[PDB]
Design a protein around this nucleic acid. Structure first.
Lengths: 180, 147, 201, 185, 102, 35
RNA sequence: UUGGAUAAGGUGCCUAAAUAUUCGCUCAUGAGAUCCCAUAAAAGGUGUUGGUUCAUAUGAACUAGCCCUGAAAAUGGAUGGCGCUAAAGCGGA
RNA sequence: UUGUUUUCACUUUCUCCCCGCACUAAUGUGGGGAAAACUGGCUUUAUUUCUUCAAUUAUUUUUUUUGCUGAGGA
């Protein structure tokens, strides 16, 4: 495990309720699972979603439960379909994307990197929705379709990345990116 | 319905411009990050650039995911199943004795001798010096005689 | 960094990164020499580099061209001026750093018999995707008015012949010495033979 | 994005081929050709026992995936041109001043005169490996033959381009030398 | 041959610098073969600077300045050294000894 | 701790079941709103 | 004054510090590189990346990121320079 | 007006058959079909040093190498 390699996203589960009032004796308790860096950001984003959908904020409400959802199996290969809602500089769109990796945390991190690279959509301008595992049959994007062939194999054209211990400033003769 | 000698010789002489594939079960040498310097086995693939990796418990490395840029694929290979896991992997690695194959080529010998050499102490260092000087005397005697 | 001098072969290197490494070496009191500047490579299209150098030639101080920014055309002086501009040459320490550097187009004599070094932070194959346009700086110099390229190429092949002769002779010598060593390994005591064989010496 | 793509080019009967790290040389009954491919990331496997060549490209985007068919077609044209010669049939057009064509210098450097009656020599050189004569069928007919499709086409194009006029309305002044037919010998 | 050394060579760089902001209190030292901070920390030891003079100073032509390597600087194995006296900037690029003792 | 482990399995299972039902209901509403 | 650890800001060199990792985009025959801050639009593009809506792996219509055109001023000229394309550019972690 | 229950469709192969019969990126392969079950998953017993006991938080505990300072004088 390397801190540089790993990201900092954890699935969080939040349950909350408005304070019981005289006008409405028992309010409908709400529950929702979201992705964030840590529990404080999870609570903030949860309450923001509350303020946007249901008529309720911090002062006239409170929390009930705040837990962390971790994976059942960290070393399996799955496929994830996630719906989005983001806003461009000139409009607002939604779109559905696919991703393949070990866990929902990595899937969300990969998705955020994808958005930043492909649409310059900054982090605060994103909304995740209805992320769910999907079967191999029902994947909708060919660039993840071809990954699940019967028996994959390919070369290793990636250039070497050696340690600072040996990234010296001089050498004996020209190396080769061919390698194996 | 087969191809005999034609097929065998042809394949051999054909000689694929690319060897050392990333097929599941390959032997690799991590060469960046804290784990760098140990042997590992590729279990399966999650995507093009991100790949899992897990050597058997012999080398002392658990099962995580490591970006493929840090790997260095090696000549040898084993024949695991796609759905294999650490247990059967530890079984098959010692069944095949792949690491014995590894530390017998030029690279494996260089690695192990480098390990022993930089582990060695001052007494062994001076033993090597004195032995080299004795061999130098012998070689200069031989070369002077050859004339 | 720690030798009396370095000699750098410029086969397939990028001008900017090479200049960076050279200047950083120079600023720490280390003498560096570059050879075969005609083989310097530049990332970009030949015509783009030609256009940029065309604009550079267009530029000239109007009052008096004698005081004008010296355009130069020799590839060696192109690299030299790039390093000078990239190094703080206006001070005394910077002047020493600048004048500790020597370069000569093609091979000269006193440098063909010293080991050349290649800097793995500027090789074109490593630091360029294979599908993007690049250039050879000698052709650019010829376009901008060098007129001394084919001579350098003929000198290069003339040196190459003698280089092959020397390399084959030294290969013969080294293969003979290896046989001598392996044959004389067994005349030493068993303790010394095991000491050698343990560490592969 | 994809990972692996490929194409297969059948090798014709009488051709002999030799490839070395995308440097191809090809001999045959009608000459020899040499072409490079070093400007392309491409793997080529040549199985001369069962003919054909397999050309593959790994980790590609459509930009660099396009050139795979360029390579395959160019190789196919090389083999066709070395087994059978490439030929171009040209026709010359003359309204009132009949065009004069002179064939000298051992099938190279044709001269043209009388085009509009200029009385000035318009001549063009020929690329190596290209032989250009006038056919025994029709007077305004010219045969161009050779091995390389590119060489013969460049010679034909130079012939076509070294005759045009200036400041004359081409939409009515239709005289000139054009391309009639592409042919295989 | 003779004249054993048992020390490593180092190169003196500028002082503890910052663009258009000097701080002539420490000295920057680079070592022979160290490249990372993890291996640069291995050195907390004494340092001797030796330089020559045109004329004799105390009966000999050589005088020296002592110091101690305090703490690694940056990530690429460059160290900060504190001496009894500030190194004159005439010294940049000259060789300095890091002694095995202590 | 097996009883607590069973309880945790049950509660997280119920959470995911509720989420899946929400997904299915939203999908059905989208299908209805399609035409 | 003596040490330690930071802010803003930077980590190719000038210039003290990462040719650091990792995730995508960008070929520019006038690329691009921080608010004040030292200009750029209406309209376009069968350049390329990703989407949505429809039609039987294809046809259309849209949609937004980068890029190209639009884009012209006088001493020679400036992302600060050098230069930078498996970035030392863009947007993140 | 929500909870409750049901159907099929889901993996390993260095297994085999039929068509192409050598067609592959491939020491194999595309498509159509057979196979159990070493691979993998689950429910039992005894162990954890053959091998892990991870990562994070709460409450404690040390440690390895060393830089700088030494005010005052009860």
């Amino acid at each position: 495990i390397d801190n540089s390699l790993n990201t900092n996203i954890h699935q969080y589960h939040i349950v909350g309720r408005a304070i019981p009032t005289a006008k409405d004796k028992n309010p409908n308790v709400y529950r929702m699972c979201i992705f964030a860096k840590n529990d404080t950001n999870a609570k903030s984003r949860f309450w923001y979603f509350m303020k946007k959908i249901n008529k309720l904020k911090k002062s006239n409400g409170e929390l009930l439960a705040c837990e962390q959802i971790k994976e059942r199996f960290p070393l399996r290969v799955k496929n994830y379909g996630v719906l989005l809602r983001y806003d461009s500089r000139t409009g607002t769109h939604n779109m559905y994307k696919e991703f393949r990796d070990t866990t929902k945390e990595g899937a969300i991190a990969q998705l955020y990197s994808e958005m930043a690279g492909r649409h310059r959509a900054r982090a605060s301008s994103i909304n995740i929705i209805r992320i769910s595992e999907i079967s191999s049959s029902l994947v909708r994007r060919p660039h993840i379709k071809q990954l699940l062939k019967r028996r994959l194999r390919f070369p290793a054209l990636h250039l070497p990345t050696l340690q600072k211990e040996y990234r010296k400033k001089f050498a004996s003769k020209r190396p080769s990116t061919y390698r194996m | 319905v087969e191809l005999t000698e034609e097929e065998k010789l042809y394949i051999s002489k054909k000689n694929l411009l690319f060897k050392r594939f990333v097929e599941p079960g390959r032997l690799c040498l991590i060469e960046y990050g804290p784990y760098a310097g140990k042997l590992c086995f590729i279990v399966d693939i999650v995507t093009i650039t991100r790949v899992i990796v897990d050597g058997a418990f012999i080398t002392g490395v658990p099962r995580m995911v490591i970006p493929l840029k840090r790997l260095k694929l090696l000549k040898e290979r084993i024949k695991i199943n796609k759905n294999c896991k650490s247990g059967f992997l530890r079984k098959t690695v010692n069944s095949t004795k792949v690491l014995e194959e590894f530390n017998n080529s030029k690279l494996g010998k260089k690695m192990i001798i480098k390990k022993k050499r930089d582990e060695a102490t001052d007494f062994e260092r001076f033993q090597v010096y004195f032995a080299k000087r004795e061999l130098k005397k012998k070689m200069t005697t031989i070369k002077n005689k050859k004339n | 960094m720690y030798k009396k001098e370095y000699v750098i072969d410029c086969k397939g290197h990028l001008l900017g990164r090479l200049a960076s490494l050279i200047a950083k070496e120079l600023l720490n009191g280390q003498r560096i020499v570059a050879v075969r500047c005609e083989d310097i490579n530049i990332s970009g299209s030949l015509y783009r580099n030609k256009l940029k150098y065309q604009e550079f030639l267009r530029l000239r101080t109007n009052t008096n061209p004698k005081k004008g920014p010296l355009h130069l055309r020799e590839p060696s002086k192109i690299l030299w001026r790039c390093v000078r501009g990239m190094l703080p040459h206006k001070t005394y320490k910077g002047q020493l750093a600048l004048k500790k550097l020597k370069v000569c187009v093609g091979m000269p004599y006193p440098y063909d018999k010293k080991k050349k070094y290649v800097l793995p932070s500027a090789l074109r194959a490593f630091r360029l995707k294979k599908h993007r346009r690049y250039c050879r700086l000698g052709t650019l110099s010829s376009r901008v008015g060098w007129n001394y390229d084919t001579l350098v190429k003929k000198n290069e092949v003339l040196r190459k012949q003698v280089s092959k002769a020397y390399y084959k002779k030294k290969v013969n010598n080294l293969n003979e010495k290896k046989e001598i060593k392996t044959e004389a390994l067994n005349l030493i005591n068993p303790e010394q033979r095991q000491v050698l064989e343990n560490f592969g010496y | 994005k994809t990972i692996v793509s490929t194409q297969k080019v059948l090798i014709p009967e009488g051709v002999k081929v030799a490839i070395n790290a995308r440097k191809v040389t090809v001999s045959g009954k009608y000459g020899t050709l040499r072409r490079s491919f070093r400007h392309l990331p491409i793997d080529i496997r040549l199985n001369k026992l069962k003919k054909y060549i397999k050309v593959v490209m790994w980790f590609g985007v459509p930009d660099s995936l396009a050139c795979i068919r360029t390579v395959c077609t160019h190789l196919k044209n090389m083999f066709t041109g070395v087994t059978k010669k490439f030929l171009y049939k040209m026709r010359l057009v003359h309204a009132h001043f009949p065009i004069n064509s002179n064939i000298v210098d051992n099938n190279t450097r044709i001269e043209i005169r009388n085009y509009l009656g200029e009385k000035s020599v318009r001549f063009v050189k020929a690329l190596p490996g290209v032989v250009i004569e006038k056919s025994p069928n029709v007077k305004d007919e010219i045969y161009v033959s050779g091995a390389d499709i590119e060489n013969v086409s460049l010679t034909a194009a130079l012939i076509h381009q070294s005759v045009l006029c200036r400041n004359k309305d081409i939409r009515k002044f239709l005289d000139g030398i054009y391309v009639s037919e592409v042919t295989t010998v | 041959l003779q004249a054993v050394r048992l020390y490593e060579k180092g190169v003196i760089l500028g002082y503890k610098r910052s663009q258009r902001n000097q701080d002539p209190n420490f000295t920057l030292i680079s070592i022979k073969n160290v490249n990372t901070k993890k291996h640069a920390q291995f050195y907390v030891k004494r340092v001797a600077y030796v330089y020559r003079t045109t004329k004799h100073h105390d009966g000999v032509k050589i005088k020296c300045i002592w110091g101690k390597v305090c703490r690694t600087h940056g990530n690429s194995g460059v160290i900060r050294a504190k001496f009894k006296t500030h190194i004159p900037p005439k010294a940049f690029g000259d060789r300095v000894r890091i002694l095995m003792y202590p | 701790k097996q009883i607590q482990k069973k309880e945790l399995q049950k509660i997280n299972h119920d959470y995911y079941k509720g989420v899946a039902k929400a997904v299915k209901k939203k999908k059905k509403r989208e299908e209805k709103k399609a035409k």
